């Protein structure tokens, strides 16, 4: 990870949070249909390790990490006086407190000495499972496939898109239209234009996470118990 | 060189060629550098 050295000095782990993922519950509630009855309970689960895992953002550890990085930025601003600059970094900057990295952005240059055999399997799986879907041959980034729906829309997602800078929004739309045109013929880009895994940047996950936190803010500081 | 007492060419070079202000340059995020 490009963020790792910072995480190194805050006493955190240099390894992606994609590892350490674990099952803590038996039943998955609230039960959601249209799963089949037994599957609706969630006793037996099928995962490909590429789920969003958004609800795990409601943790004290993640907040501590975010505030540690923010405190580093504020300390630098106090020393130098470039506060403005340091609070307007692009969320793809490793110093931004909400920096997020896909597991494959560092799977090729990972330490791999501290990984459990299960975690080594996870690394190999991340690379190969990315290769299988062939969104890298469509000239597309993974976050381009995070799109909202007409009904049951993902609210955060919509906001996450409106926070993008104008040029990045336009580039996202243009990539999506090119992928649409390619998909008409089920065509791929020339083999030299394949997306390298380290180029598959997660440019929308920081905005997504910031929106999630801002939406939970008012819940934890209620005006009153029976308040909208 | 002087057309009727005027160094018109000189005047032209000083008056007839204003600079043209183009579109503002957009700084490219490092993750968009790949073509």
């Amino acid at each position: 990870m490009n963020d790792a050295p910072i995480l190194a000095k805050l006493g955190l782990s240099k390894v992606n949070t994609y590892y350490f993922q674990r099952r803590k519950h038996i039943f998955a509630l609230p039960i959601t249909i249209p799963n089949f009855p037994l599957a609706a309970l969630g006793i037996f689960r099928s995962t490909d390790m590429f789920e969003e895992r958004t609800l795990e953002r409601y943790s004290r550890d993640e907040r501590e990490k975010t505030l540690g990085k923010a405190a580093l930025l504020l300390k630098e601003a106090k020393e130098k006086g470039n506060y403005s600059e340091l609070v307007r970094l692009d969320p793809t900057d490793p110093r931004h407190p909400y920096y997020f990295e896909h597991p494959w952005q560092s799977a090729l240059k990972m330490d791999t000495v501290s990984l459990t055999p299960y975690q080594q399997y996870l690394r190999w799986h991340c690379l190969t499972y990315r290769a299988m879907h062939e969104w890298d041959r469509q000239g597309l980034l993974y976050d381009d496939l995070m799109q909202p729906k007409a009904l049951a829309t993902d609210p955060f997602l919509e906001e996450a898109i409106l926070r993008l800078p104008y040029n990045q929004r336009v580039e996202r739309e243009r990539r999506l239209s090119r992928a649409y045109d390619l998909a008409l013929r089920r065509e791929y880009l020339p083999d030299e234009d394949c997306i390298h895994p380290e180029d598959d940047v997660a440019y929308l996950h920081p905005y997504y996470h910031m929106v999630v936190d801002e939406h939970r803010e008012q819940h934890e500081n209620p005006v009153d118990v029976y308040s909208r | 060189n002087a057309v009727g007492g005027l160094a018109t060419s000189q005047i032209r070079d000083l008056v007839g060629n204003p600079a043209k202000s183009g579109k503002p340059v957009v700084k490219m995020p490092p993750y968009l550098k790949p073509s």
């Binding site: 690379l127 | 993750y31 790949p34």
Partner: peptide, 20 residues
Amino acid sequence: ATTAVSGELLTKTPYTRPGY
């Protein structure tokens, strides 16, 4: 494709797409 902490872009490691 993201910059390092210093702000400079490093060279991508060699990569062969996984086979069938």
